[PDB]
């Protein structure tokens, strides 16, 4: 079980001003630290955020959080469930800022809500240094869905933070699960993120911001545009036919010719964006399943599971015979890979 700690700096807050926090399970025989960002969409104006506060309040407030949580998938401490990193120090950071982990704005006389996701990550890191992270060899910042996009937006800032605080030996790496999206044509989002950024005082990686410049920061929320600007090593996990991508594309699965062509073109475009991503795992599945599910071990690409691919990635950061790290399906239709989640 992971144990809740509310941030000691209580001015770093969830949307409603309650303190943010993290769940921690220490493994004192390990110098590996896994910090996982929860997902859960976002909100981008007063009326939309008010609705979320009524029926998704745990994603906006710590007032009702439980004292403990169970680690599952890559956050499990059991070797059978987590062949990759079962002995690591485990951290789960709840998503309570509704800003895709980009915000740096407090409540005030003019702001009904606080959007502090980027500051929440930095404060968790800072408070963990006094609890053993100062002795780490590797800090893996991971996340799923909006948390996977959050990894892409924040991994280099964590690296910079540790360097400036005097910890140059900790190697910061990223694992982005189901956060790699395309700004493609719909079958029947960039506007909502554009408004969200202004509402949140959202911040993006500086090298990406310098490319796209003022007012165009929304580009940096798209993996294929922000990834080439990052310096930390980042492993990308993305279904070729991700259900959230298809939802924003207004696709809801007898498929006729126009829809068949649309779905096949989407898979090919996703494949193309991963061609120059050397550490990646992209199965040809229609899914919303994420890496904290207990059966995450079951899916294979070309005969290699994701826990194995991640272990090969570890070895590469010390090509390897029998230990691949670039695993992208080439078949063109959902479930043409037999190991897809049922
Ligand atoms: C937050 N999120 N989770 C799943 C999906 Cl899809 C989204 C999403 O729509 N966006 C806007 C465009 C790209 C990045 C964030
Ligand atoms: C608490 O966090 C806020 C926001 O990041 C910061 O302005 C303030 O200096 C912090 N306080 C302390 C004591 O570190």
UniProtKB/Swiss-Prot annotation:
It comes from the Eukaryota. GO terms for molecular function: palmitoleyl hydrolase activity; phospholipase C activity; protein-containing complex destabilizing activity. The keyword Glycoprotein applies. The keyword Cytoplasm does not apply. It catalyses: [Wnt protein]-O-(9Z)-hexadecenoyl-L-serine + H2O = [Wnt protein]-L-serine + (9Z)-hexadecenoate + H(+). Its EC number is 3.1.1.98. Rarely expressed in adult normal tissues. Keywords: Glycoprotein, Hydrolase, Phosphoprotein, Secreted, Serine esterase, Signal, Wnt signaling pathway. Its main location: secreted. It is found in: Secreted. Glycans are attached at residue 9. One of its GO terms (cellular component) is extracellular region. The active site is at residues 145, 242, 288. Belongs to the pectinacetylesterase family. Notum subfamily. This is Palmitoleoyl-protein carboxylesterase NOTUM. It comes from Homo sapiens.
């Amino acid at each position: 079980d992971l144990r809740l700690h509310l941030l000691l700096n209580t001015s770093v807050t969830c949307n409603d001003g309650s303190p943010a926090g993290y769940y921690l399970k220490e493994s004192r025989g390990s110098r590996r630290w896994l910090l996982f960002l929860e997902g859960g969409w976002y909100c981008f104006n007063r009326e939309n955020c008010d609705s979320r506060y009524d029926t998704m309040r745990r994603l906006m407030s710590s007032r009702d959080w439980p004292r403990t949580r169970t680690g599952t998938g890559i956050l499990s401490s059991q070797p059978e469930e987590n062949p990759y990193w079962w002995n690591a120090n485990m951290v789960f950071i709840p998503y309570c800022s509704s800003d895709v982990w980009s915000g740096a704005s407090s409540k005030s006389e003019k702001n009904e809500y606080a959007f502090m996701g980027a500051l929440i990550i930095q404060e968790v890191v800072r408070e963990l240094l006094g609890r053993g992270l100062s002795g780490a060899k590797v800090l893996l910042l991971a996340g799923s869905s909006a948390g996977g996009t959050g990894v892409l937006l924040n991994v280099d800032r964590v690296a910079e933070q540790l360097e400036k605080l005097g910890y140059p030996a900790i190697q910061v790496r990223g694992l982005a699960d189901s956060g790699w999206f395309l700004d493609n044509k719909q079958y029947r989002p960039t506007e909502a993120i554009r408004r969200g950024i202004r509402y949140w005082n959202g911040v993006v990686p500086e090298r990406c911001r310098r490319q796209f410049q003022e007012g165009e920061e929304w580009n940096c929320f798209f993996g294929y545009k922000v990834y080439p600007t990052l310096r930390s090593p980042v492993f990308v996990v993305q279904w070729l036919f991700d259900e959230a991508q298809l939802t924003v594309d207004n696709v809801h699965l007898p498929v006729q010719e126009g829809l068949r062509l649309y779905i096949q073109n989407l898979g090919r475009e996703l494949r193309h964006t991963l061609k120059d991503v050397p550490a990646s795992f992209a199965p040809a599945c229609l899914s919303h399943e994420i890496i904290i599910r207990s059966h995450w071990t079951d899916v294979q690409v070309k005969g290699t599971s994701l826990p194995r691919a991640l272990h090969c990635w570890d070895r590469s950061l010390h090509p390897l015979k029998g230990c691949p790290v670039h695993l992208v399906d080439s078949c063109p239709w959902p479930h043409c890979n037999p190991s897809c989640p049922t």
